[PDB]
Every structure is written in C-alpha cells, then in structure tokens.
Amino acid sequence: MKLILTAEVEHLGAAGDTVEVKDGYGRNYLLPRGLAIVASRGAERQAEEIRRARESKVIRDIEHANELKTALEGLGDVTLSVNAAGDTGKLFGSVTAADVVNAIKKAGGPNLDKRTVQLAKAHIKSVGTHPVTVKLHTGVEAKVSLNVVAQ
Amino acid sequence: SAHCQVTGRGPGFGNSVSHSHRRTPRRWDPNIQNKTYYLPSEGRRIRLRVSAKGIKVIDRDGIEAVVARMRARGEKY
RNA sequence: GUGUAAGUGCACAAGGGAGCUUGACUGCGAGACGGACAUGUCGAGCAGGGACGAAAGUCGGGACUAGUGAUCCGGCACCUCU
RNA sequence: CUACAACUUGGUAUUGGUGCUCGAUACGGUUUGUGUAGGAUAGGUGGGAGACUGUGAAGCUCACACGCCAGUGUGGGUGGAGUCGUUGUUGAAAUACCACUCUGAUCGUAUUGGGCCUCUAACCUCGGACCGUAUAUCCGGUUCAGGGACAGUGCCUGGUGGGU
RNA sequence: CCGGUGCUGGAAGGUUAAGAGGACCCGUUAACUCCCUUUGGGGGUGAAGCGGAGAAUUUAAGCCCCAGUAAACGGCGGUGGUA
RNA sequence: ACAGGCGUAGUCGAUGGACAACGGGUUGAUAUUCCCGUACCCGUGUAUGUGCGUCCAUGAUGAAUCAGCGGUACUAACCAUCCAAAACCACCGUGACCGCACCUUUCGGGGUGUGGCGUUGGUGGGGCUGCAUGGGACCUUCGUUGGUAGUAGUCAAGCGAUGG
RNA sequence: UUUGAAGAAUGAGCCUGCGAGUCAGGGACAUGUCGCGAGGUUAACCCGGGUGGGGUAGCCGCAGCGAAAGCGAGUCUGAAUAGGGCGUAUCCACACAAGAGUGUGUGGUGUAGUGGUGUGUUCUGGACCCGAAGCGGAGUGAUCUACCCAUGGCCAGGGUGAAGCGCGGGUAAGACCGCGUGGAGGCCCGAACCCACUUAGGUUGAAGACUGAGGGGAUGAGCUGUGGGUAGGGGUGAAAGGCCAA
RNA sequence: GAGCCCGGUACGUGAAAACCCGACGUCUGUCUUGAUGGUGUUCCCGAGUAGCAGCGGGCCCGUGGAAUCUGCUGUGAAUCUG
RNA sequence: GUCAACCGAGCGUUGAUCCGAGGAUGUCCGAAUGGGGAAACCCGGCACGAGUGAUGUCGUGUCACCAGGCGCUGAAUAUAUAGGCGUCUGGGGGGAACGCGGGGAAGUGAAACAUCUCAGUACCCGUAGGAAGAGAAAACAAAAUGUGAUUCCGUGAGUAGUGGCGAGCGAAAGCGGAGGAUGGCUAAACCGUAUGCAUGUGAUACCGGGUAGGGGUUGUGUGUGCGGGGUUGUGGGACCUAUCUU
C-alpha cells in the first residue's frame, strides 16, 4: 500500500514521508485513523498530505486546554453564510459543521472539531438564531451566542 | 450463503476429478468474510459480507463509492 | 546318436569332425495347401549386394512339427509425407 | 475395485509490528593463487620507471591466530628512513602504484525466508454492563474485560475412511 | 503371551503431495559467414524477449521404525525314552 | 446457492385452573333449557336517604440556610524509622600495573608469600541528603444545634396498575 | 412346447363383443414398374380457394491409384520396364510371344445412371402384444402399532407384618432379647382391567387371526384416556431383522 | 332421397355505446450561435478487469499438443510503435 | 331456464320473453390482508350515523406485512445513527402450453460394468412476455481486391472428426432463402456549474489580449451531482491554429 505518512512511526520514518508498506498494516492501523493517505495522484496526494498535516498539528487539546476553552467558548457572535429562500422562512440546505468552525476560524480563532459540535441541538432548517454547545470536557461544556445571515 | 454484497460473486458447481472420473460436484464457494469498516460521513461502523477481492476493491476505490453502488442494487445492508 | 516330449525320417546320412565365415540379408513373388472368419504353411523364379567353392551350385536360420498373445493406446531411430 | 461424506495435515487470501536466532542471494573492503632457477605459496593478469612512508614505516618482544604446523598476515608500543627495480633465473614478475576482478573463508548493506518471546488494530468471545425494550437466556449496537495474527471460513493439496 | 491387527505415546532416521524455486536445454529470430545457378534459395553460429515441458534444493501429516496396552480384536503345541 | 431451517416478542392451543340453580310437573315427540316455586352472579339506569371531601381550610410533617461548639484534613509545616548521593576510618586473594629469592630444555614463553599508588573488586559503624509512614490541629471543613424557613409547598373522598 | 404327449405335462366353464409386425424418414440394401436418359432431381421458400407453376443452394453419376504430397488410363511400392496390387463395362476381329496355366499392342461395338412408387429385410424411436422383482425424483402418511412429552382418571376384597416409636428384661452404659404400635413391599391368593401358556373347535369361518373351559400379572419398570411430536436409507426399537394405516 | 316447404346459403346490408388500427390538428420537444475542410505536437478511448497459474463446466474435442467461450480462489497491465 | 311434468297466479303492441356493450349491487372463505381460526366461522378497535329511559344492539367505512420516497425525533452517546411515529405509491397470489438463467437423477444401451450413454431429458427453483432470449462485430475468411447485426428454416453432413477409437455422439465455415433498422444512446480526456471533505501566496492571480476599480468570478487542491463537447477503425476525439465563414 503506497501511502504518504502524516505522523512519525517506528521503522517507517517521519511525517510527510512516502513508504510502500504491507497492505493490512496500512488497511487497519494507519489509514482508518487519519494518520496516512493513499498515493494515487501527485498533486491530490500532496494537497491532502499538507492539509491533513496542518489539521493534525492544529487539532490537539488537553484537559486544561478544555478548561480554558470552556471560558473562551463565549465568543462574539459568529455569523454563518447562507443560500436559501426567504420566501416562506425555510432553508434550502442544512449547513455544515465545517462552515461553523471556519466561521469561528475567521471570527474568534479556535479551529475546533466538527465531531463534538452539537448541531442537533441547533435544529437548523428553521430560519432564526440557533444556540449551540459542544463536548469540550467530560463534565464542563460552555455555550456560544449565534446569529444567521438573513436570506 | 447470505450472498456477497459488493460484486455478486456467487457459487458455482463443479463436478468430476482425475483417476477415472465419478461425476460429482462440490460447489466452488467464493471466500466471503465478515470484515467491518467505518463510515466517517455518517459516523458509523458497518459490517459486511465481502470477499477478499471486494476488500481489494474497497482499498483502491473507497467505501462511500461502494455503498452508493450497493444502494443502486438496493441490497438490504 | 540325433540340443529339449513323441512320432515320421536319417547309414545315399539330417550322426561325428575340421577350414572359411554371417543369407540368423534387402525388394518381391507365379501357383498351391489348409480353409466359417482372422490367423497359419511351404513356395520355384527375378534384381541389387555378398559368403563358400576350382566350378556346377547351395545359403531369405536351426532334420520337421511346439517354444508364445490379435486390436486399441503410447514409446525409440530414419524419411524429399502434411 | 473405484469414489464421497465426515475428520485431519500443510500452502495461500483474511492477516499485521517490533526483538532474537538460523539460511543462501546481491553493493561492499576482505582471507587467499606451495612448478624447479631460489629471499622463494612466483595472485595469475592490462598501463608499467620508483615505493607506499611521514593526515607518523624497518628488525621487533608480545594481544592474536591459522596450520599445506618449513610458514602465513595482523595490532598497544619502541623504531624515525627498511626492505627493494625486470630483484636473476622466466610459458609468467613482483608480493612496486593502478586495476577489469575469478577457484576462496570471513565479515557491513537492500533483501529473501523460517522458527521462537511478545504488543494490538484486523478477527473471536454461549464473558459482563447499558440501550432498541414495557415485556425479550433471541438479535443488533456502544463499552469494559479477555484471547489473538492462532483459531474460524474460501480455494489447491496428501492421508485414514464399509460411515455411505 | 505385545509377535499379527488395532488404540495411545515419541520422532533419531528412510520414502514422502501441493506450494516457493527455475539450473540446463528445446522452439522462434535481430545480426553474420561459406554453397551456388543467378532474377537470392539453402546451411551454421544464432543477443535480449515471448513460450514449452523443468531439474537441483527446501518441504508437514502419514507409512516403515522404537517402547506400552489384552475386564482391547485375539492365541495357548508335538515326537521319543526311562520305575 | 434459491426452495427453505430454527427461533425471541407475541399469539393459539384442555385432556387441567377460576366462574352464578335445585326440586316437581307438561306433549305424540324437548327439557337443570318452557311452566310452577324458591335462589344466586354480572352490569345498568331513576329516585330515597346515612355518612364525603375537594372549594373554607381542620390537623401533621420536611426543604434549608447566615451560621456558632469540635475536626476528613491541597495543607505552611511538626512527634519516630531505616537504607545509599558525594560519602567518613580500619583493614583484605588485586585487569594492565611498579616488581624481594628461587623452581624452571642451558635461555625469547608456565609462577609464587610478604612489598606500593589504583582501590574492574570485599566487611564493619557514624555527622549524613531523598524517602513515606502512624498521631493533633490550621485553609478548604465535615460531624453536633438557637433563630428559623412543618412560612410560601406538602399527606389525608376515591377508583388505584398492562407494574411489585 | 417337446427327441417323443390320447396323454395322469401347461392353458381353456359356455356364448357374444374387444385384443398383437404398425407409422414416420428425399434414411440403407435388394428387386418389380413408370418418366427422363449422359444425364437425372430439387430442398427451404414464393406465388397458388385445391392437388399447379417457379426456385440451382445441394446430392448422385460421368477416372482412378496412393497413407500423403502428388500423378493421371495409368498409378503405389522399389534402386528397377521386375514382378505384383488396384483400376482401365464387356465382348468382338487381326497380329506377335509363349503353351508356367495366356499375355501384350492395334482396330472397331461402344458403356447407364437417376427420380417417383409398390414389396421384403433393416437403422433410430415404446417398434408384433401382455407380464416382473426392483432403480430414481417430488410429495402423503404415527387416528393402527414402536417410543417420548403435557394433563387427568382406574386398580373389589382378604393375608403377611419391614424401618421407626414405646414399655419391659439386659447393660456400668451398650450391643442384645420379649411384648406392643406402626402397616413398607418392582410382597402373596383373587375380580375388574392388560395379556395370550396349553388344549379342543373354527379353518369356501360368527371372525382377513375368534370363541369355550383353564392360565400369567393384578401398588407398579403399571394399564388406559384426551391433546401432541419423531418419517423413508430415514424413524423407533427392555433388539425378534420387529413395528411405521389388514 | 326436397334447388322451387322451412331454416339459411351466393350477394348486399347494419352500430347509439364501448374497444383496436391509423389519420390528424393539440401537446411535447429538438436543431437552430453554423459548417465544411486544414496543420505540428501533449491528453482520452469503459480496471480489480483482460492476461498468467490451480481445480471445473461446455464447445465435434472424455486432459490431450488443445486455441476461442467461460465459473471460484490467488496474483495482477498498459491507451494507438496500445 | 332446464332434467320436468302438474298446479296456481300473472305479464305483454305503451313493444314483453330473447341478444349484445357498459354500469350498479356484489353475504362468507380464499394471496386474504384488523386479531384469531379445524377454509367458508368466532371475537373486536376507531370516526360518523340510526336506535334504548342508560347499557346491550345495528349500519357505513377503515386498521396486516414488507420495499422505496417524503415528513417529526436521534436511545446507549458526543457527531449522529439503527429504531420509533405519520403520510404517498408499489409488490404479495392463480394460470394450459410456449421462453431465458440456475440446479439436475435413474431405470435403460454398452448382451456384465464404473468412464461414457440414456439426458443436461424428467423434475425442482427464480423470474417474464405476448412472444421471449441473442443482437450491432475486440466476428468470419484467405491473400479472392471478399463478406458485412442477430435469429429461425434447407444443405454442407451423418461427412472432417471425437470416443474404454467400444456402444455411440457429432459440428462449423460456406451456399440458397424468409425479414430488413448496413439501428440508436452513453462514460473519459476538455469546459461551465452547484457543490462537499481540506487548507489559506492569505496574492500577481481568478479572464480574450489591452486601457483597469477592486482584492479574490476563493487562491490553489479533490471526488461528488447537473449541463455542454464527444461516439469511431482507412483510427477517432478533446486540447491547438488558419480558411470560407448559408
């Protein structure tokens, strides 16, 4: 399995490397963790490796970082870009978690995980202003104040 | 069997042998297994009945692709 | 006595002995026997190329009859067939 | 007699990581070429007129060892300019520098493999707990704990086989 | 009574499938060197490649082999002479 | 392979469990079934009245605090223990090692007891730094009570499980 | 049908009716007949109210020998015209050679097959007709009988008198002994009931496996009822190769 | 035993409604913003597939020298000098 | 109506009886479908309506199962999912043969028999249709300057061949014919697109050059769904780039 590493591993090398390894290793251990990527294309593999490396470096957190993000979760109003019909007051399409987290990227700063976003508690597809909360800690969770771009 | 799911590599029915024949089949099964996988899209673990061949197909083709191809066939996965 | 059972024959020797020696060949074969059929048996004579012999002539295994097994399927050498 | 079920053996896909040990393959410096003339195991071989030394050498005792035990090269260290130039003998010349590199024994580097001690992430759990579930010794899902690349299944293969 | 057959155990050996290997050869031919009448036909070497049947070697169980086992199937003899 | 095989929820299934009627008379034929008489078990209406509690509120409970007495006790830090960081003195068969007289083929190699730094090495005790332990408290504080705050709320006609 | 049957070898009660060499197919071979004649004939199909017209793709003949290349009234083998094999419709007339059996070269006479149909035999198909035991596939069946499950019921009557318990003797205490109670038992005699040992009868039966008189068990490894389950190379079997709808 | 009795035939007639054929006009698209040819090189021409090996089926073909077509496993390529 | 008469009572020129096409009603079982069930018979729910002094009763409807679409929720558990609730459309079974894909015997013949044959037949399964399936060359052929989708019929051919070279099986090419549509539609390179998982030259790039505001038609990636372009064999096509430019 020709794949491009993302992190450092025993007897393979370091991040960014290119290795031909055993198929099952790459099948079961690395590739389903987001720790590697198939080598199918030059620029496709290059871009994926670069972006995945940046995101893996930037995704980390600790318990105390959660205790601090529990305070920093009361950010300013992070707005969301929308294409919908304002005719009746219903939205065409549901809006991603990437969109919310990239809005936080370009307004507040923290580039969080789409996973922990309680978007279900947002209940998008009703035109208004949805609240939000996120599994920051085991026990501690803080809240964000939000608004929507009228369509 | 429960039948394959990604390709449709069903059985077959052989027959005779060497050392004088005797006429007599022996199904040539396919090699299905019970490997599981993970759908990052919908956040879920799926178990399938897939041959090693089909695993090959997956790892050089994706899983989303495969479930869409199976949705076509409307297998009750 | 005849290599080996028995018979028919062998002294005119097919018995015994000595010298050369490879016909213990190739290509054929008139006419005949015996014959359910397939098998089986002899066969003069012609040609090349030889043996022996001075020559005539004899030699296509053994004095004769037994000593072995069809067809199919494969194997080896040679062919100016495909 | 021939064959089949069932059982069983091994190879292979599922099916991987590190460590050790035992093989041969190739990139690599290496041990090592007893024919008399005679320092004489004369590495055969193509340029070929100095020979590497001094970015520290003879003869050397000793760390070493083979051994065709006459002999062979190797290193702490003195030594501080020593054997040597066709040394001359020859099919053939140095064993001077340089080198395509073979009959060799050793050993680094990619490997190709196996066996053994293990980790877990595939896989298995009629082990537990919770949920779907109000009822469910079913089934599924999450999780804990455990086993573990073994087992199970598929394909090829050898064997026993009146069980049929 | 452990020889015969079977069961259990243990491999120092011998035979031992598949698979991994792929030496050496045989087909084909890019390219040459002679033969000949001439309007190139017939001979030899014949690179790599593609193919053919392929050995050497490494190969487990089993079998042969070594012991145990009969409230396991099973088996248990004769002649002669002397008071 | 497909046909189909099993099977949980559940649903059917008495040969059993629970559940309210006995005697006499009658026709040409039925009879605990109709008739005569006396009884019983479900439900359902109308009305009668004895006690009824919701509204009134009649009695009877808790929340839980600001906090006071003494005490788990990040704990600033305290009462007793050893071992070994660097380690202190005494001594003992010392890798190379500096080296009394002699065995020893007549000698280049095979050594010994005392002798000296080193102390790859060995035993003993004492100023000893790191160590955690049980005991008593201080911060946090958890245990015992005065106001309170059984005040606003709360239980009290009934039927009451498809649950125990 | 038998060497041989009036045959005491088989078959037939009698009548009436029914009941066994057939058809397909350009099939094969042989032979009659008809058309054509070195030629013969079409198939599918198209057109046709009909049985008729067309349709040249094909087949059979017209030259064979040889494994084959290949050659050709010759060819194959072989070194060979040197013999032979096969073939050259057959006869006829003249020659030359031998009478080892006749051959060889000329001349003329000139070659007859094919398509319909009929008959006989024949090939493939059930192939003159009737007749098995038994093989395979898919299903039906445990209401009889074999066994198991779930739930109820039945076993008159009379005897024997285990364990235990009590009293008494005995004991140092026991063990032990006697009297009583208790009333167990794959216990006993005997009806119902379940079986079926002997024997007689029946034996074109009352009966497609019974009756009469006797007999075994008869509180248990019981008999039975209602409902249910196991199904064919499979079930079930206190096991006989027994039972699974006479 | 019927041409001339009857029923009916040869022949010609007949459908308010439903059904089927086409026929139309609706309705629907669809090319119209276009084409013929030129010219030198990069890119594409249907991937777990075709191919090869191991067991097998069926093809005139019974594993045979055995193509083409294929089923299960295992391995596994290129895009037109393919 | 009739076997099938008898009796009684009636209707009909105002057009009956009779025939044809469409409608209505259409008890109960049956795929059977509210639940259940020994088939045609037992019990119910919900909305409405009729009815009783109230209950009982009665009538009209509707309630199964799965597959898909849409809608609400997203349990363990965070994303979120399986699942749950509502609505909408389908399927469900029967059939005489005919078809396609799959499975798949045996008696028979071989004078035995296993390979073979009987036969890939019978039978079984899954799905159809009025017909099915196949079908446009990764084909045949042999140097002929050929053919040109497929299928079904005739012949080739009982041949070449295959085969315990035994029984027996057995083509195709080619040729003549029926019918003709020598038929069409897509993917990919390449653009324009909505996007969706990612990131940030955070800039000399997103476009027709150029005169240029911005300061990103997101800057660059990558698959997804839509739209263009493209459908070939003597190769074509998309980029490119001239020419006439209906």
From Swiss-Prot, chain A:
One of its GO terms (molecular function) is rRNA binding. SUPFAM superfamilies: L9 N-domain-like, Ribosomal protein L9 C-domain. Keywords: Ribonucleoprotein, Ribosomal protein, RNA-binding, rRNA-binding. This is Large ribosomal subunit protein bL9. Belongs to the bacterial ribosomal protein bL9 family. One of its GO terms (biological process) is translation. Binds to the 23S rRNA. It comes from Mycolicibacterium smegmatis (strain ATCC 700084 / mc(2)155) (Mycobacterium smegmatis). Pfam families: Ribosomal_L9_C, Ribosomal_L9_N. Binds 2-aminothiazole antibiotics, which are antitubercular agents. Coiled coil: none annotated. GO terms for cellular component: ribonucleoprotein complex; ribosome. The gene is rplI. Transmembrane segments: none annotated.
